[PDB]
Amino acid sequence: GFNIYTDESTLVSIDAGVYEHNGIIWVYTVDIITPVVNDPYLWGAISTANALSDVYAMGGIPVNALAISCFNNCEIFREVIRGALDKLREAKTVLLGGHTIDDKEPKFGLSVAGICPEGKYITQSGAQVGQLLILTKPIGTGILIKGLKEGILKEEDINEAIENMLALNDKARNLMLSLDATACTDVTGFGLLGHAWNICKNSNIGARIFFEKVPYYQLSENLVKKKIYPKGAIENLNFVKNYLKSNLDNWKLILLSDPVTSGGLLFTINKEKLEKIDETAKELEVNYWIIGETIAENVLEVL
Amino acid sequence: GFNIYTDESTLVSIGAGVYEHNGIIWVYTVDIITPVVNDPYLWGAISTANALSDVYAMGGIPVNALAISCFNNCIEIFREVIRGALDKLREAKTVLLGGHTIDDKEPKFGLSVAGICPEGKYITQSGAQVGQLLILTKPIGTGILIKGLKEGILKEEDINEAIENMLALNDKARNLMLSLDATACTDVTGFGLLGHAWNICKNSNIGARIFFEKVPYYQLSENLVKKKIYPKGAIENLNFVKNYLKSNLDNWKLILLSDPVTSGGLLFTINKEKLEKIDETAKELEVNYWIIGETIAENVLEVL
Amino acid sequence: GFNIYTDESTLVSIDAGVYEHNGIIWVYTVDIITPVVNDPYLWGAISTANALSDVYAMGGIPVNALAISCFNNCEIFREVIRGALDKLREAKTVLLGGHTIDDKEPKFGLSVAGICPEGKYITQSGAQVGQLLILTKPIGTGILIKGLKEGILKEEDINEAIENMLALNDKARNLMLSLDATACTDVTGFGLLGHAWNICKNSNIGARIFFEKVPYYQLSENLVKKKIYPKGAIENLNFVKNYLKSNLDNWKLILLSDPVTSGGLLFTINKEKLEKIDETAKELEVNYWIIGETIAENVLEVL
Amino acid sequence: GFNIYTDESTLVSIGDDAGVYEHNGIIWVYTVDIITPVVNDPYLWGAISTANALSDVYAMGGIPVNALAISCFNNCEIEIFREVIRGALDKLREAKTVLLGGHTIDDKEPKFGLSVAGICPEGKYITQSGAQVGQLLILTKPIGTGILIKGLKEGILKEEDINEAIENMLALNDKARNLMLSLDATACTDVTGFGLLGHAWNICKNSNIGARIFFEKVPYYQLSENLVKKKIYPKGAIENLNFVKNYLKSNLDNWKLILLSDPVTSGGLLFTINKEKLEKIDETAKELEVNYWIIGETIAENVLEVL
Amino acid sequence: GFNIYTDESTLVSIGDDAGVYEHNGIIWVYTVDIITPVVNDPYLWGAISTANALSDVYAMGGIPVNALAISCFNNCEIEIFREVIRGALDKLREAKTVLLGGHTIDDKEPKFGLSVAGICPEGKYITQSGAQVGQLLILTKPIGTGILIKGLKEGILKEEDINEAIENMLALNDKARNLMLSLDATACTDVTGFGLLGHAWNICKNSNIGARIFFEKVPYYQLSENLVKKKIYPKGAIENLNFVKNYLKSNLDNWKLILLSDPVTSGGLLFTINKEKLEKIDETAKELEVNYWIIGETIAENVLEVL
Amino acid sequence: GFNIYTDESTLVSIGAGVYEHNGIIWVYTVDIITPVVNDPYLWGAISTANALSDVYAMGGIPVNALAISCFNNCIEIFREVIRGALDKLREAKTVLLGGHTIDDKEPKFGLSVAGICPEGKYITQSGAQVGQLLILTKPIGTGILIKGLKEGILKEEDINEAIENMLALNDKARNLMLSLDATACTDVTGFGLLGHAWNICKNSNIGARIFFEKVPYYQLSENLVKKKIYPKGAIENLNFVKNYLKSNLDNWKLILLSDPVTSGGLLFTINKEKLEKIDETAKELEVNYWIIGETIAENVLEVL
């Protein structure tokens, strides 16, 4: 008889993007990293957790993925894939295959596709003034990873960091969504200050972070005080310098700028949500730290 | 780098449908008819013109089509039917994509047609206004002639003018119609002139006044109807409009006006200020026209 | 360079079915009903909640839908659609259009498409012996709807039933998933006994239901005792008679077999989950009633 | 129950994303055209660039259907682009063309344009290779915009001094397309960056024929003549002239050849018609509300003559 | 950067889901064939029905690629079907054909079969309308299964009494297809429900030619002859004979015409070859490991002669 | 009622790829070459045979192709090139879908080809076993002849046999190869006989022993190489296999054996028990063959 049918879709690309089609939202991300530990299996697992986090940070549910590496261009990859498969299985994400890239520097990662149901798509631009900044994993891995490279540390010294890098941000995403977070991102290569600033620039606001409230590995502090830290840290710190307000020692600023690998989620929530955060977090079995709040002035304050 | 792409489409089916996709509008129609003349080739050509008319009436440009018939189910003759359809389609710059056989025993042939309505020019039947003139581009009365031909009362040679008109594409009429900024349009086929005029009135929530003495029809059509010679479809069309018909005209006239038409012309509404151009526009486009009436406020069909 | 790509999909049809493609699961359902109240708007809203429940019952997240009615074949539909749109908006589901059917009997409903993330697809065949039967809405609407038709009741008398028929089963789905239910279905036209039996047949087990533990409207009891009940009730009761074991009065069996409109979810959970059901249910803001347990013998016991 | 269905399509592309697509009787044309700022008004830049991009489709006898915006975005500089888009949207609305989105390009040099898709109904696909000997060359807009835009940059002229040219650059070639189709033109192209001579030569090469152009019949802004004489002209004019020097025969003063080679922005259509068509060209143009100038005729010798 | 791409496809279907599809040089054939139980062994029913369905593709010179199971399922009666599927799977594996799934039909009468898709490489698409006069008719399996399956139902015979026929019904016509293609056959069909005469007539009608069949050259089960004489035969045989009575010329005893019209299940291929091909037919068949019988020749008169 | 449908596919790209979908396997390859003869038509035909060989070598049946060249970028001659490609494609029952122009200045032409491997018969280069015989279906040494022709040392008339072999499709050879149940196969082209033999050894983790006196090559090829006349590609191929080459043969022989071949024959491995059929099978299929060696355990190339 009489029939009416409509179809609509939108694609936004910034192999990264967001796709909406008749009510469903898909997010696509790509993330590849250089070895962080001298164990192929751990590298595959960590790289996978790191890549999936791009999706979790958007409130997404990872669905499938493609392995990406410099194969042939850079037996070890067999262990790398084994580690990636285990982490993917834990994440209930399907590996659809792999793509080789032209690069001589050893790198591995994934391109991931996820879904954001009921329009629950979270960006880095919805933050408002007077909200709390919540972080779900410690920082300082960059410092530890360098310590390893310099032969100052051994893997056994940083098992806590490795355990955190291995951890999926699925529980963190659930906490973030449960508290109706207005903005979210994960903490990786740009450091805690860099990613916080990303939220500040895209939301047109500023942030106040309290160093004493930021979780980090004791060993990261010990190493940074002895001038042991990655270059990315200096690059990150300088990137926010023209917007940074702080009278804290340089080592604290370097620590806060240290490139993180497979870090936790960094998101903003209203002060009222503070009433249920601990209980919600406990039920979900995920850690959280309240590190500061957003301000109107477009600067980054650290005290 | 930063890229944004959108896509949207809508499909509206009534049977026959209209599809819009990112700015372009396609119209789809289907029309099959029983033999109207003894010549298989002419039957193919006439059915084709008749099927394309559906698209022309909507302001569309026919693009492609699919032949539909019960061949092998109702063979050497269908070769001529296709030949006629192909020649007419070539004339209409429309491509034949193939054919489909339906479950039927009664000899019938026609086409499924797909066309496009450029610049959003999609002409419907619900945009007519009161005080406009009703224009018709082809005479009526073919149903009565076809009956006579079937009855053996007439020969094809007697109705050559009707055959020429049935064979004629409504593309020039569509252009005239668009050129005069028509507010509504439809083609005249099986439901008779009154029926299709009523379709416009119904959809435009308006009325129409038609003058019998201004309606073009074949002389032979009048002679046959006066001898009680006409299609049963004429009675069906008349009885269907009688609840909305206001007229005192003799029966033969109402029957003639209700006579099912094959590959008829276009019936459309234009403003009276266009009456100054219509003649020169029609001469250039090479298409005849007849002012048969005007729209009125009262929702009825006034046949005077 | 070297590339490997795989693609796989499965389609199962019983316009109803399940579709799996590279890790994602979609469920498609169709559900249309006759008017249940003399208010077009309420009918549109209720029919919508009822149709979406087919998806919720499978653990699905409704995404989009198409309206289905006997339009032209049977101004009122304008209010029907208005009601359907409101309920769809509440459900965060997109209406893509409508399809007309050949029928002279006034009916309206939806065809719905939903998603089941992380393989969380729930059927009616995973129930095991010794599990608890949980129900999330009262039964007895069929009796009340007849009472209305017979002019014995007026809409105002059954506002509680109307409120329940209007309610989305999204919170119930969340409870059901949170408790890791092994099987689930919603309660509609086949009555509570019929749908329970559906779980029994597909899971190859039986069920024991306690009448005194089943939630139902007081007015439904009053009416059924006075021989006021729909035919579907008798049809449902007879459908399970050759598998029914009970010494309860006929009115109680008729009530339990009464066709429900937009009923709650009926699912099975392990006894241990009983420890968190109340708290979980309270957090989700959804009611629940423990009406019985599954048994090994393939019969339906009611006491 | 017998059934027979056929499907066929052909795609011919030139390079980037410019091509012709035919599918079961319908013909689609795709083009892309981006230009550097023309005037100092952001809004006018978006509007003019749009008219310019749509022209590639009109010139092929096409009806624009939809488009995609293309600009350096963030790679060149974000308040002017808002105005640029506003101008584009207004011009597209006028052209009844839908904007489907946008695409960014890595370019430090400010540029904006559109990728456009249009259709050519009833196989009315007009190319640059169907011209015959003895046909008339028709132009629908004056030339000389390059020289005026140059003078505007040299501070020699003010924005207001070229309102006539701006009005012409803003005008859609849809009416010109209709005239061209109505007169059954055998070949058509629009006049842009390559200058009148260059675009005329494109028809000559692809049609393997020649052209004879009469300078005194060519429409151009008087202000453009005033400037070329004063050595005021874009370098693109010199390049264009040099591009056609191997096939050019003329004894005219250099300033005339420079004017004729001057890069045009959003110019008119340049097409060929049979001589008999002169009988109704004037009446048709007035009805369509478009201007036209008969600037010459095609000849057999594969050369370009200007006198 | 110049590019030209073309695409074309044609689809011809007969009714249900049986047709021929051509797309840019490749030809796909689709067929569907379901039969009622043939023997009392569920496994053999699935295996035989499969060989029977695949035959529709082999007969067209095709290579089966994938299939879909089709059965009444739940509409006819669920332990036998498990065995039926097992038989189908074994036969498909042997045919190197992938089972993509299944489809249920509303039918109370027990039936099972397959929808099959295959390809005809290098345009080797063999039909029933390319036969010429003076060609030989070749058959690759005996006929008479209808009469034996009938006797099995009448309790006249035991399952074991027809192991020879069962072995032939189980055999894939892939080797026969290879022989047919190797000898450059001009037309081919398989012999099923319509009987030998009926399927031979199909070639005659579509090729607009005639056939002359020699009864003494036709291979058939001796047990089949024994039964027809005793009035033991399927009614389908009578129907088939009547279907060809308007085009049949023969003076042979009725039991011979009944045998020749007897419905066959999973029969051999019936194809036409030029007489010169007899030179290598025997050697080729032995190499391919397939049997063959020359049963007659085609003639000009559009009739069916049996002597 | 109750219906279940599944779908699955895999794509493996190496550059060139293999695609499997619900039981069918398609292979995709690409091959372009510089002019080898002065005749534009012969160049088109030879390049085509050379491009199709990639598919034949895998046991495939070519279905369609796309022409690839730098025409207009490296015109009246390319008309002859296409004519030659079209004639050869017709012979191969392969359809030309169109063409693509690449960014290159050096005159080159070839095709992108798509083919199918029926009944799962996908022949690779990693299934050879020790103790098998190495079969070659066309002589080698065309690289040296083409060099001589380019140098003006030879005329096309002098190398008509090489041209006939370059023009020949490897479809008959593929059939022979499949007929003898070959365990591995490849075609001989630019990497020379030793190079392609090594590809099989490398992928099969086996070795090969080749007898120079059993290898077919054009007499003129031997004469030219002995006069220091040969393609630079020959030196490149030889130096590439020298780390896996065990031989004491004179330089000219190794160079000849490493000489880049154009539209060469197939090189495949079969069991010695097949040596009793190969001759009659080859006569029927109408294809020449040469037993040039046998596979060995040691992972090297023994050229004796």
Instruction: Tell me the CATH number at A71.
Output: 3.30.1330.10
* E100 and E137 fall within a common domain: no
**Contact present, C193 and C257 (Cβ < 8 Å):** yes
| Selection from E284, E81, E100 nearest residue E175 by Cα | E284
**Contact present, C93 and C64 (Cβ < 8 Å):** yes
- The structure tokens listed for A257 are 């700028």
**Contact present, B135 and B292 (Cβ < 8 Å):** yes
**Contact present, B166 and B246 (Cβ < 8 Å):** no
How would you classify the pairing of strands B266-270 and B184-187?
A: antiparallel
* Nearest residue, CB atoms, D2 vs list B2, B64, B72: B72
Radius of gyration of chain C (CA): 20
d(CA A162, CA A37): 9
Chain A residues with CB inside 8 Å of B6's CB?
A: 8-11
The torsion angles phi and psi of D284, rounded to 5 degrees, stand at: -60, -45
d(CA C216, CA C191): 12
* Burial of residue F279, with CB atoms counted within 10 A of its CB: 0-12 exposed, 13-18 middle, 19 or more buried: exposed
* A78 and A104 fall within a common domain: yes
* Nearest residue, CB atoms, A6 vs list C23, C96, C117: C96
Can you state the angle between helices A159-166 and A141-149, rounded to 10 degrees? 120
- The structure tokens listed for F293 are 């060696």
Q: Is C195 flagged in the annotation as binding?
A: no
* Nearest residue, CB atoms, C14 vs list F2, F9, F13: F2
**Which residues, other chains included, contact A127 with Cβ-Cβ below 8 Å and sequence gap of 6+?**
A182, A183, A199, A200, A202, A203, A205, A268, A294
| Selection from A12, B8, B122, B28 nearest residue C96 by Cα | B8
CA torsion sign for F195, F197, F203, F205 is negative
Please say which residue of E101, E126, E151 terminates a domain. E126
A103 SS3 class: coil
Could you tell me which residues are beta bridge partners of residue F267?
F136, F186
- The structure tokens listed for F209 are 């022993």
* Nearest residue, CB atoms, B5 vs list A3, A5, A11: A11
d(CA D187, CA A87): 63
d(CA A193, CA A254): 10
Radius of gyration of chain F (CA): 20
Smallest CA–CA distance from C280 into chain A, residue: A283
Please say which residue of D83, D103, D126 terminates a domain. D126
Please say which residue of C67, C100, C122 terminates a domain. C122
A236 SS3 class: helix
Residue count of chain D: 307
- The structure tokens listed for C48 are 């919508």
* D286 and D141 fall within a common domain: yes
| Selection from A256, A260, A251 nearest residue A164 by Cα | A260
* E84 and E218 fall within a common domain: no
Task: Tell me how far CA of residue E142 lies from CA of A96, E252, E258, in angstroms.
Answer: 50, 19, 15
The torsion angles phi and psi of D104, rounded to 5 degrees, stand at: -95, 145
d(CA A234, CA A229): 8
Chains that touch A (3 or more CB pairs under 8 A): B, C
* C147 and C231 fall within a common domain: yes
Q: What is the DSSP letter of E128?
A: S
* CA E53 from centre of chain: 8
d(CA E186, CA E272): 6
**Which residues, other chains included, contact B300 with Cβ-Cβ below 8 Å and sequence gap of 6+?**
B201, B207, B244, B245, B246
**Contact present, C142 and C273 (Cβ < 8 Å):** no
d(CA F291, CA F273): 13
d(CA F152, CA E305): 70
Residue count of chain A: 303
Q: C54-57 long-range contacts, Cβ below 8 Å, gap at least 24?
A: C54/C29, C54/C30, C54/C112, C54/C186, C55/C27, C55/C29, C55/C112, C55/C114, C56/C114, C56/C168, C56/C169, C56/C170, C56/C172, C56/C173, C56/C186, C56/C265, C57/C122, C57/C169, C57/C173, C57/C184, C57/C185, C57/C186, C57/C265
| Selection from E48, E184, E80, E69 nearest residue E116 by Cα | E69
C105 SS3 class: coil
**H-type helices in D17-79, by residue range?**
42-58
The position carrying tokens 């940070």 is A57
* E202 and E146 fall within a common domain: yes
**Which residues, other chains included, contact D207 with Cβ-Cβ below 8 Å and sequence gap of 6+?**
D128, D129, D130, D131, D132, D187, D298
Return the amino acid letter for E110: P
Return the amino acid letter for E165: A
**Contact present, F166 and F50 (Cβ < 8 Å):** yes
* Burial of residue F223, with CB atoms counted within 10 A of its CB: 0-12 exposed, 13-18 middle, 19 or more buried: middle
Residue count of chain F: 304
**Contact present, A245 and A300 (Cβ < 8 Å):** yes
* A142 and A280 fall within a common domain: yes
**Contact present, E46 and E69 (Cβ < 8 Å):** no
Smallest CA–CA distance from A115 into chain C, residue: C117
**Contact present, D196 and D264 (Cβ < 8 Å):** yes
d(CA C148, CA C158): 9
Q: Interface of chain C against chain A, CB under 8 Å?
A: 1-7, 22-24, 61, 63-64, 66, 71-73, 92-94, 96-102, 115, 117-119
The position carrying tokens 């040691």 is F298
C103 SS3 class: coil
Method: X-ray
**Contact present, B223 and B148 (Cβ < 8 Å):** no
**Contact present, C41 and C79 (Cβ < 8 Å):** yes
* F59 and F173 fall within a common domain: no
Chain A residues with CB inside 8 Å of B2's CB?
A: 13-14
d(CA E196, CA E188): 13
Task: Tell me how far CA of residue B295 lies from CA of B187, B192, B300, C257, E268, in angstroms.
Answer: 17, 18, 10, 62, 74
| Selection from A197, A208, A212, A186 nearest residue A266 by Cα | A186
* CA D142 from centre of chain: 12
d(CA D116, CA A175): 46
The continuous run of DSSP H or E covering E103 comes out as: strand E98-104
State chain E's maximal CA–CA distance in angstroms: 79
Q: How many CB atoms lie within 10 A of CB F120?
A: 13
d(CA B204, CA B227): 37
d(CA A133, CA A290): 6
Nearest CA distance, F91 vs chain C (angstrom): 33
User: From edge to edge, which strands make up the β-sheet containing D304-306?
Assistant: D187-190, D269-273, D136-139, D293-299, D210-213, D304-306, D248-250
Domain that holds residue D159: 127-307
For residues E256, E260, E266, E271, the Cα torsion angle rounded to the nearest 10 degrees is 130
**Which residues, other chains included, contact D216 with Cβ-Cβ below 8 Å and sequence gap of 6+?**
none
| Selection from E211, E224, E241 nearest residue E132 by Cα | E211
Chain D residues with CB inside 8 Å of B66's CB?
A: 5
Report how far apart the first and last C-alpha atoms of chain B are (Å, whole number): 70
| Selection from C118, C8, C1, F25 nearest residue A98 by Cα | C1
D267 SS3 class: coil
**Which residues, other chains included, contact A139 with Cβ-Cβ below 8 Å and sequence gap of 6+?**
A187, A191, A192, A214, A215, A216, A220, A255, A256, A258, A260, A263
Q: Is B233 flagged in the annotation as binding?
A: no
Chains that touch F (3 or more CB pairs under 8 A): C, E
The number of distinct structural domains making up chain C is: 2
B110 SS3 class: strand
The torsion angles phi and psi of B88, rounded to 5 degrees, stand at: -70, -40
E33-45 CB burial, b ≥16 within 10 A, e <16: bbbebbbebbbbb
Q: Is C130 flagged in the annotation as binding?
A: no
Residue count of chain B: 304
d(CA A84, CA A42): 8
* Burial of residue B215, with CB atoms counted within 10 A of its CB: 0-12 exposed, 13-18 middle, 19 or more buried: buried
d(CA C174, CA F133): 68
Q: What is the DSSP letter of D301?
A: S
**Which residues, other chains included, contact F25 with Cβ-Cβ below 8 Å and sequence gap of 6+?**
F18, F19, F116, F117, F120, F122
Helix, strand, coil in percent for chain F, rounding step 5: 40, 25, 35
The position carrying tokens 């019929």 is C194
* F273 and F130 fall within a common domain: yes
Contact B3 A12 (CB under 8 A): yes
* C25 and C93 fall within a common domain: yes
* B219 and B182 fall within a common domain: yes
d(CA C129, CA C205): 7
Nearest CA distance, E125 vs chain F (angstrom): 13
The continuous run of DSSP H or E covering F166 comes out as: helix F160-167
* C153 and C175 fall within a common domain: yes
CATH number for the domain that contains residue A149:
3.90.650.10
